[PDB]
Design a binder for this molecule. Structure first.
Ligand SMILES: Nc1ncnc2c1ncn2[C@@H]1O[C@H](COP(=O)(O)OP(=O)(O)OP(=O)(O)O)[C@@H](O)[C@H]1O
Ligand SMILES: Nc1ncnc2c1ncn2[C@@H]1O[C@H](COP(=O)(O)OP(=O)(O)OP(=O)(O)O)[C@@H](O)[C@H]1O
Ligand SMILES: Nc1ncnc2c1ncn2[C@@H]1O[C@H](COP(=O)(O)OP(=O)(O)OP(=O)(O)O)[C@@H](O)[C@H]1O
Ligand SMILES: Nc1ncnc2c1ncn2[C@@H]1O[C@H](COP(=O)(O)OP(=O)(O)OP(=O)(O)O)[C@@H](O)[C@H]1O
Ligand SMILES: Nc1ncnc2c1ncn2[C@@H]1O[C@H](COP(=O)(O)OP(=O)(O)OP(=O)(O)O)[C@@H](O)[C@H]1O
Ligand SMILES: Nc1ncnc2c1ncn2[C@@H]1O[C@H](COP(=O)(O)OP(=O)(O)OP(=O)(O)O)[C@@H](O)[C@H]1O
Ligand SMILES: CC1=Nc2nc(N[C@H](CC#N)c3cccc(Cl)c3)nn2C(=O)C1
Ligand SMILES: CC1=Nc2nc(N[C@H](CC#N)c3cccc(Cl)c3)nn2C(=O)C1
Ligand SMILES: CC1=Nc2nc(N[C@H](CC#N)c3cccc(Cl)c3)nn2C(=O)C1
Ligand SMILES: CC1=Nc2nc(N[C@H](CC#N)c3cccc(Cl)c3)nn2C(=O)C1
Ligand SMILES: CC1=Nc2nc(N[C@H](CC#N)c3cccc(Cl)c3)nn2C(=O)C1
Ligand SMILES: CC1=Nc2nc(N[C@H](CC#N)c3cccc(Cl)c3)nn2C(=O)C1
Ligand SMILES: [Mg+2]
Ligand SMILES: [Mg+2]
Ligand SMILES: [Mg+2]
Ligand SMILES: [Mg+2]
Ligand SMILES: [Mg+2]
Ligand SMILES: [Mg+2]
Lengths: 160, 160, 159, 159, 160, 159
């Protein structure tokens, strides 16, 4: 089987938790599309061009990952990319109820698309991009949670 | 016993999940008031006049339902309507903690009003008006989750 | 409109939390059947005959309650009692998850039987028959959580 | 890319919910090992030989499934089956909490074995082998939840 | 041991639930700093000066409480106050997942600071400042949940 | 200010997660009593005398810890130890729900005894004595989760 999977999200910014999930996905599937939402409901800290560049640099060492921006329904994107697996990261702090709503709705929209839940290292099980951004805005040390390029970009963003 | 019950909410828009709960309520209580919030904290997609007309058309086949708009505390509304039962729908994806907060506060405000939790069909256990609206805004098929009149109204709203 | 509800459980023994739920049910429905499961699988402390007698005495002040024992499938028992409402009490999330499985299975077995969930007073939101028995087994005071007749029966059983 | 997955459990007996999960697994991976635990600690209704025969008949229509019994540590069994994916099914929050503990322990024992969680159809989201057995023990109809061969075996065991 | 603890939050306004938690904290620790967030993400109903005055009057009977405003990371505040305990109130309706995220992040920022979770009376286990404010805005009786000074201040605020 | 805390449990056997919690407690309070329940109802693997000896050796490096066994109601034991704090560890939501019931009951029995909940390191957030015993029963490596003395005792018990 030549399996194609999508890993959708806002990635605002990509963290070590997201890196852990996409790395695990690359070990089980032939091709992984890290799919970045162009226009989320909440205005992102980083623009789409910034989010894409940061994710590309942070996943450049993974040969079977492609980073792509999208603005449509994640099921419509998977359909157009010929993907049959949608990857979701399940943290210790996940909103399990929302993950159930999302998976059942995604199955209604594209029944041939299977939702696959992967668990990150215990190291990243208790973080989110929102939490990292709030800590960094309040002058806290978040270096451990980010790839080096993201740490540099976040410092630059908060400086101005 | 001549029991009167209220079923409050925003109904923005009314879905098949809400229809399932109000239908179950009509089988156990003599009179059910489907109570639509006039001024919710978050600006609704549909105006109160639209939400009321849609709920009336979608419940017209139920002889013991009355659709009414309200702007006061739901306990104050129940009190003025001589209702002694407040219906809440409990989904598989419900925020059980919030339902507990709400029921205990409603009991403090009107101790003679009993909160009754009803469970929808498995078919509607994983949806919400918010999720349906987000899917439809992103050009997804939500026909299965709505009464026909609501499907028509939602298409018209998103077209403009 | 001649509405009959059934409130099933093990009631080993009946607590003030169960009394709170059955009282709320009697204010809503014309007739409430408090249905006590023989429940041998849970190895109960009190026999079914003891549990029925204790619940009858504890609910004697409520005119529209009838206490009965059963070993049947609960949906068949509700049908045979001409009940169209099955009452369950919700204390917390642990109750909610299992109560969803049970209610969907009861719906499959009897679609016209509606499960209705009620919430107890904050006073009894954190108690169970198991917790009360564990405290009493270790000689802790449980008079606050039980009807008088039940407390004296529990003390006698452990004596 | 010659991907092998293991789907371990007690399967006492295998239900339509388990069939839903193993079917989803076969559409994703080249070969799926449905691994039935001897599980004497849970005092199962069916012997391991019975559970293996029932699951083999219930999954015979799926060409890339292999049913096997085991008493080993599940991470050692996955290694010995050359599996790099361990499939688990998630019905609700109760599953999620325990499944996190299990997956972190399996990762400690075999880091290259990835736990993959799948969600069943809404149809089977509220069932378990325990619930089905409890309904059948009380003579309730469970034909909707089990493969035909399993339903007839369950009726025979309780007869 | 001469222990110093902080009890941080928005306290918008302080309720009987917060009073219950700070009272329990004063019984176990030598000094408790009730720490009020100056600039929360969401605009508060009461200004910082109002929140501080209300908390001071409501805790004046507790000899070992100090009320202080802060705008920095709660871990940075604890560090500067020489506090080694951070008090969190855990309601029946708490977002346990968020409490786990927060405690693990606080431990990353200041490992010598221990998070201590205290449980309020059953009486206040189902309320929040948000719920109290929503009920009061909709003309509901919230007197039972507040200290007298807060009840007076809330009536004045909603009148204008 | 001469503050005494009690940390009660079954500790069958004591794990690195329990050691993490008792260590955090010793940094907060002047004296900590690690209280081991005889707990015959849970049919423990180790006798109470074994559990006390293992915990004493595992906590010998902490100067303000005292290990003791008890069969009493835990609130009565805290009173008799002159403790005003009862320490409990929180790993996840499953702990939280039951810990709320327990803490409200302990408050009813001894209002001046304050329950204090502590969270372990992420390293031990997903372990329990039951999980460690299940892995060891299936010959899986549990050296990472236990003090050296406890690991050797567990291997000997299963041998
Ligand atoms: N620390 C993490 N560990 C594992 N999975 C994660 C982690 N952070 C995010 N994910 C998952 O990755 C996907 C994309 O996440 P997303 O871009 O929304 O980041 P996020 O941290 O969830 O964002 P936000 O905090 O703004 O809600 C989702 O499946 C999400 O659950
Ligand atoms: N799918 C559904 N099944 C059962 N009950 C439902 C369903 N949707 C809503 N309810 C219940 O009906 C009542 C009114 O709901 P409301 O108008 O807020 O819709 P909603 O889907 O909860 O809205 P939103 O998604 O905007 O929060 C509440 O008791 C709610 O829990
Ligand atoms: N304190 C309580 N408040 C509200 N509902 C309750 C309470 N105790 C029990 N119930 C509910 O009453 C029904 C019958 O409960 P049951 O006989 O199992 O008692 P229980 O307290 O849960 O006993 P056990 O601890 O033995 O399981 C169930 O729906 C249960 O959730
Ligand atoms: N209805 C179902 N839908 C999805 N996954 C399921 C379902 N039933 C079981 N599973 C999952 O399949 C795996 C094996 O389950 P197992 O053999 O324990 O069956 P079970 O139904 O949970 O039985 P029991 O009730 O005896 O514990 C687990 O990951 C479990 O969560
Ligand atoms: N009723 C209460 N009982 C116990 N702890 C509480 C209560 N209300 C708040 N707390 C706790 O006190 C601290 C400060 O709370 P905060 O100022 O955010 O009030 P809040 O009620 O949580 O606010 P909001 O409703 O705006 O989110 C937190 O640890 C919080 O969990
Ligand atoms: N890994 C851990 N991290 C934090 N707290 C823990 C951990 N293990 C146990 N605790 C807590 O320590 C106390 C005593 O626990 P107990 O002796 O029951 O151990 P346990 O690991 O839960 O054992 P069992 O699996 O046998 O129930 C409880 O408050 C429990 O929640
Ligand atoms: C069942 C659903 N399918 C969905 N697809 C999208 N797509 C948008 C595309 C853009 N920008 C999006 C926005 C934010 C994050 C992500 Cl990952 C994706 N949203 N959406 C839902 O809310 C529900
Ligand atoms: C204990 C509570 N009682 C309450 N009553 C109301 N009423 C408003 C009326 C309007 N518009 C409302 C707004 C949105 C949805 C609904 Cl269902 C009702 N809100 N409210 C609370 O937030 C809490
Ligand atoms: C869908 C279900 N229907 C069911 N009916 C019964 N009946 C027994 C009767 C006896 N003894 C019982 C046992 C314990 C408590 C109660 Cl309330 C009822 N059990 N059961 C289930 O477990 C599931
Ligand atoms: C991290 C773990 N690894 C484990 N391996 C096994 N193996 C037994 C084999 C037998 N009988 C088993 C028993 C019941 C169900 C299953 Cl799926 C597997 N148990 N176990 C754990 O409890 C934890
Ligand atoms: C790990 C974290 N540490 C944090 N410290 C702060 N401090 C601000 C200070 C101000 N204004 C604050 C805002 C609102 C309530 C409180 Cl209690 C504290 N926020 N914050 C996080 O969001 C996460
Ligand atoms: C409010 C409660 N108080 C309680 N005290 C005890 N004591 C026994 C003593 C023995 N053996 C025990 C058993 C197992 C673990 C512990 Cl930590 C303590 N149990 N108990 C409850 O179950 C509830
Ligand atoms: Mg996110
Ligand atoms: Mg809603
Ligand atoms: Mg029970
Ligand atoms: Mg199972
Ligand atoms: Mg708050
Ligand atoms: Mg334990």
């Amino acid at each position: 089987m030549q399996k194609r999977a999508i890993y959708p999200g806002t990635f605002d910014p990509i963290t070590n938790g997201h890196i852990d999930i996409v790395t695990r996905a690359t070990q089980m599937f032939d091709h992984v599309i890290l799919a970045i939402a162009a226009s989320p409901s909440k205005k992102p800290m980083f623009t789409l061009e910034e989010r894409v560049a940061l994710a590309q640099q942070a996943t450049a060492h993974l040969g079977n990952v492609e980073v792509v921006g999208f603005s449509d329904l994640m099921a419509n994107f998977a359909r157009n990319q010929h993907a049959t697996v949608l990857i979701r990261g399940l943290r210790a702090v996940a909103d399990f109820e929302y993950e159930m709503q999302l998976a059942h709705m995604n199955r209604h929209l594209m029944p041939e698309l299977e939702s696959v839940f992967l668990m990150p290292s215990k190291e990243w099980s208790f973080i989110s991009s929102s939490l990292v951004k709030e800590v960094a805005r309040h002058q806290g040390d978040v270096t451990h949670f980010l790839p080096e390029n993201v740490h540099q970009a976040l410092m630059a963003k908060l400086a101005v």
